[PDB]
Amino acid sequence: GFKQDIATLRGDLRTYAQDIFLAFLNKYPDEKRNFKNYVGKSDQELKSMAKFGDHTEKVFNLMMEVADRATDCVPLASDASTLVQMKQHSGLTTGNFEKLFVALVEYMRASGQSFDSQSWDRFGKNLVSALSSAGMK
Numbered sequence: 659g660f661k662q663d664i665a666t667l668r669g670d671l672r673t674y675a676q677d678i679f680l681a682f683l684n685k686y687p688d689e690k691r692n693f694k695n696y697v698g699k700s701d702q703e704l705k706s707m708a709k710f711g712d713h714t715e716k717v718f719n720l721m722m723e724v725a726d727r728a729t730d731c732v733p734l735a736s737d738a739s740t741l742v743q744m745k746q747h748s749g750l751t752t753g754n755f756e757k758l759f760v761a762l763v764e765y766m767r768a769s770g771q772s773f774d775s776q777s778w779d780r781f782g783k784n785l786v787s788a789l790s791s792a793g794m795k
C-alpha cells in the first residue's frame with residue numbers, strides 16, 4: 659500500500675522522479691510555462707540535463723517526505739504551508755499540483771507493479787485541499 663510505495667519509489671528515486679515528471683509534462687505540455695528551459699527537448703535530452711535530474715529528485719525527495727509524514731494519506735498542515743510559502747511556487751495554483759498527481763496516478767496504473775494508485779489519488783486530493791486551506795489559489 660501507500661507506505662510500501664514510498665519505499666519502492668525511494669529505492670530508485672532518481673529514475674521514478676524523472677519518469678513521473680516527464681509523464682506529467684508530456685500529459686500536460688502547457689505546464690512547461692513554469693519550466694521554460696525544458697521547452698523544445700525530448701525525454702532523453704532532459705535526462706541528460708544536470709539541472710533536470712537534480713531538481714526532479716529534490717522535488718520527489720520532498721514529496722516522499724510529505725507522503726511519509728502523512729496519516730491515512732492526509733498530509734501535515736505544516737508541509738502544506740511550506741509548499742505554499744516557498745518562493746519557487748509563487749505563481750502556482752492548486753490545479754498545477756492536481757495535474758501532477760493525475761499524471762503520477764496514471765503512471766502507477768500503467769505500471770505492472772502493485773502500486774496503491776487509489777491511495778496516491780486520495781493523497782493528491784488531500785494535498786490539494788491542504789494547499790487551498792494554507793492559502794494557495
Ligand code: HEM
Binds near residue numbers: 712718721724758
Ligand atoms: C508535492 C508536490 C511538490 C513538491 C514536494 C515540490 C517541491 C519543490 C522543491 C523541493 C523545489 C526546489 C528544488 C530545487 O530547487 O532543486 C521546487 C521548485 C520548483 N517547483 Fe515545486 N514541488 C511540487 C510541485 C510542483 C508543481 C506541481 C509545480 C508546477 C506545475 C512546481 C513548480 C516548481 C518550480 C517552477 C520550481 C522552481 C524552478 C525550477 O526548479 O526549475 N512544483 N519544488
Ligand SMILES: Cc1cc([N+](=O)[O-])ccc1O
Binds near residue numbers: 715
Ligand atoms: C521545478 C521542477 C519540478 C519537478 N517536479 O518533479 O516537480 C521536476 C523538475 C523540475 O525542474
